[PDB]
Design a protein around this ligand. Structure first.
Ligand SMILES: Cc1cccc(C[C@H](COP(=O)([O-])[O-])NC(=O)c2cc3ccccc3s2)c1
Length: 113
């Protein structure tokens, strides 16, 4: 395992998120069921080729990293919420996670380095 990995992600928050607001929405009103529906919708469009991971994140990610087309830069273990960390370090470079759940909300993650 490398010291650090580089990943991009797409976050979908819900009303029960630890901080139910984002750059794109003053109050997150969607239900967590709806948030996971969106994430799985995104996964299937990216698998089919109909959508690009990084374009989706720049438009709809509730993380401010959307301005970076989803890129979070490099990080080591011990910095991110543990479920996020574990999924990231389990990916191969170029691979995409399934749904990842954290206190911030629901993620799909793409390891780039
Ligand atoms: C577990 C987790 C991983 C990444 C992001 C979040 C959401 C978190 C905001 O969700 P919140 O704290 O409101 O519940 N964003 C960040 O930690 C980061 C944003 C950026 C922007 C640019 C570059 C690096 C970073 S790290 C949570």
């Amino acid at each position: 395992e490398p010291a650090r990995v580089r990943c991009s992600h797409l976050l979908v928050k819900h009303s029960q998120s630890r901080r139910p607001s984002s750059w794109r929405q003053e109050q997150i009103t969607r239900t967590q069921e709806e948030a996971l529906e969106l994430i799985n919708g995104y996964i299937q469009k990216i698998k089919s080729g109909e959508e690009d991971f990084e374009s989706l994140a720049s438009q709809f990610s509730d993380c401010s990293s959307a301005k970076a087309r989803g890129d979070l830069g490099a990080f080591s273990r011990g910095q991110m919420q543990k479920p996020f960390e574990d999924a990231s370090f389990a990916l191969r470079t170029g691979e995409m996670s399934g749904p990842v759940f954290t206190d911030s909300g629901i993620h799909i993650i793409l390891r780039t380095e």
